[PDB]
């Protein structure tokens, strides 16, 4: 038994992490096959970030200006192009540690594991979630740009995130592995603000289902509710509106616990209306919303 | 910026994870050099766990009774011995993915990253801490025995934990890589209880120092205190008594923030005496004590 914030084994991704140095700036790149993916702001300095015509600055850059390093080995760049906000550095030698992988753009609320990297070397791994305002609450210092978020299905490593920016409000923003930013954020240093960070409601119920099968049952209570009326209380406390799909995904969680999805919404409804009375659920004094229903069934498999 | 619960990159440890099957039971083993380390309860069934003379059951076991599997490769066992509560299965082929490693027995309060494994395959990685009652609050299902906890220093992978038991109270217990259990727990299914889980106080102050450099400063307050008098309030709320060593380890954290260690103890003292008024620190509604002072300086490096 036991429940914890778990991240995927990052071993397959560590073998894809390289260092990219373009002029004076340095960050990390994702080495898959014979292509190295890195944020396109590597071709910019601190003054360009104020407002960078990225197409103009790429005109002055050539193949030998991109230094790809994989430990004590230097990769030879023989081609480069700009795909949205990412850089595709074609190299001559393929990555021998390339795993089974795809490029998947995740949805708001889905979770993924992030490998923090600096100078192409992995520093740590933690679990993250795509907040409804299309930001993430990760740990990213300077030089962490190029770090990726991934999911692992048996043998397939599903790359989904790449760090780019840190907003002036403390959170972070980035793109998928195709270069398209998650949300209305641009790779430019300006006054960017994210929306009101609502709570992934389907991820809270899945987390409450994990507390039931682990001992924490003091929040279980003798009330039920309807989907429309629970969404009224959920909308007041800045929660995501629950849909019929979210109810279905918790089906397996409801089938094993024998607690209906609407009965869990009522118990949650009382936690929003009465608080927690100083008590804890699964070692947390607040309601955790960074566990997908699939994250629970995987940890309780 | 940003602060999160980070675990070490588990890539170096994934290359050391094998499957050990002795008779009807199966679990994971740590393949370093030509030795495979696994809990010695692999030679026991469900009925033996009631009370197992481990020396007697090992008399009936030979080399061919231990099946070591590394994916689609079977390892040949040519030697086996019992070191405390671990099993040393000598094999004929050395592990090519053996990293730089040592066997270090950590102290209560220190942190380490755990790789959850089932049937010799890594499932996830999460950060853990050695609670003062010598247990851990990890996530371990059936078949997770043999999973290890580790720290990584540049190139040295410091192995420190190996999962063995799940107590009837929900927490877990295990040994170091030399077989010696952490605490007064035995590899036997009986009525074992851990002591009162106190709070690692030095790890709370280091966590509060991380909140200062990240924005969360509402808990900063205009009071100071002494070490002896803070330990009076700390002893009431089941906290670890603060020593002069704990004060010194926070030196770097106090030097950069310009907040004295005693000033942080006073702010914490008010958090224990007044609660949190429903507010959060670093996204948590309680005081987190699973961050060593070195865990903070590493994340703020
Ligand atoms: Au960066
Ligand atoms: Au086990």
Numbering used by the authors:
A (entry chain A), B (entry chain A): 1 to 301
Quoted passage from the original study:
The main protease of the SARS-CoV-2 virus is nsp5, also known as 3CLpro or Mpro. This is a homodimeric protein with each monomer having a molecular mass of 33,796 Da. The Mpro function is indispensable for viral replication as it cleaves the polyproteins pp1a and pp1ab at eleven conserved sites, to allow the correct folding and function of essential viral proteins.
These crystal structures show that gold coordination occurs at the level of catalytic Cys 145 in the case of Au(NHC)Cl and at the level of both Cys 145 and Cys 156 for Au(PEt3)Br. In the case of Au(NHC)Cl, only Cys145 is involved in the binding to gold but still with an occupancy of about 0.15, and a gold-sulfur distance of about 2.4 Å, which is in line with the expected values. Similarly, the interaction between the monocarbene gold complex Au(NHC)Cl and the protein results in the formation of a mono adduct bearing the 1-butyl-3-methylimidazole-2-ylidene-gold(I) moiety (MW 336). Furthermore, while Au(NHC)Cl results to have inhibitory capabilities comparable to the Auranofin analogues, the gold dicarbene complex [Au(NHC)2]PF6 was found to inhibit the Mpro rather weakly in accordance with the mass data offering no evidence of adduct formation with the protein. Overall, the here reported results coherently support the view that the potent and promising inhibition of the catalytic activity of Mpro produced by these gold compounds is the likely consequence of the tight coordinative binding of a gold-containing fragment to the catalytic Cys 145.
